[PDB]
């Protein structure tokens, strides 16, 4: 081996994201005949996504994952893509990523922050688990709902009427287990592999945020690779992404049966009241960004 790359991710070994990172790594080695290798640093051992993104900018890490909307911390308009109920499905996030708006964000990521977006995959639609059944939006009143350190998720919790509790991902299981919080929200593969179902007796299909999953490489690293090495990474990303998105789609169907068998009570609230409750988020965001951006993205 001669060219050694490093990838970091928050998700643990055993997660869909890790499984796909291992595919990346295996395909990079296979297609390069062992000349290239990808080392893997899971479980947020390097920090959270925000920290790993900075490490990519500095060249201390080569590859990491990030949602398009997470770019909003550095490129404010991108946040709109993570506001609850804006993105309808994966095909919609693909239209956004490929649109002139998406291209403009991707160019800014490369120019300012040394991030080259190679693809974006489907990471699932977030759902809300809890220690009591949630059948209507009114049931969110008083719910101590853990959220990531992300304003969109915090706003979902706030406008649903819950009491948002930001917390890093690695601390969630213990907080649920001890009832320090009453619930969390994440896609179903995550709810499975993090074992949150072991400590959450209810799951509500709020369908509130569609998460993509960009594969970012340091632009400096990319430019230093040969054309052959670039082709290897492009093909590895294509192979891994096809498998990732398909696995998430399959799991979103198959996991319902599994969670029921494990004793989880699954509820399906009417979502029209949830969508209505989120409208002030869009008005505020449009006011801050200076245009009707949420509506323009929703119509892309
Ligand atoms: C790429 C990445 O690290 N994604 C992580 C996301 C994002 O940080 C968040 O959605 C904001 O974009 O948060 C989690 O879902 C969470 O803490 O519940 C864990 C997940 O691994």
Numbering used by the authors: 0 to 299
Published text:
Tripartite ATP-independent periplasmic (TRAP) transporters are a major class of secondary transporters found in bacteria and archaea—but, not in eukaryotes. First reported over 25 years ago6, they use energetically favourable cation gradients to drive the import of specific carboxylate- and sulfonate-containing nutrients against their concentration-gradient, including C4-dicarboxylates, α-keto acids, aromatic substrates and amino acids. A functional TRAP system is made up of a soluble substrate-binding ‘P-subunit’, and a membrane-bound complex comprising a small ‘Q-subunit’ and a large ‘M-subunit’. The best characterised TRAP transporters are those for sialic acid, otherwise known as the SiaPQM system.
We determined the crystal structure of SiaP bound to Neu5Ac in a closed state at 1.04 Å resolution, as a crystal structure of substrate-loaded SiaP enables us to model the SiaPQM complex. We confirmed that SiaP binds sialic acid with nanomolar affinity and that the crystal structure is representative of the protein structure in solution. The docked structure shows two calliper-like helices of SiaP, α2 at the N-terminal lobe and α5 at the C-terminal lobe of SiaP, interact with the scaffold portion of the M-subunit. Residues R49 and N148 (SiaP) form a latch between the lobes of SiaP at the surface of the substrate binding cleft, enclosing a number of ordered solvent molecules that extend toward the substrate. One hotspot involves the invariant D181 of SiaP immediately prior to β8 and K232 on the loop between TM7 and TM8 (L7-8) of the M-subunit (right). Adjacent to this interaction, the surface-accessible, conserved K143 on the β6 strand of SiaP interacts with D36 on the loop between TM1 and TM2 of the Q-subunit (right). This strand in SiaP extends from the protein surface to the Neu5Ac binding site, with K143 located two residues upstream of the conserved R145 which directly coordinates Neu5Ac. Thus, SiaP binding to SiaQM may pull on this strand to release the substrate. Analysis of these hotspots using mutagenesis showed that K143E caused a significant reduction in transport activity (but not the ability of SiaP to bind sialic acid), though the putative interactors D36A (SiaQ) and K232A (SiaM) did not reduce transport compared to the wildtype.
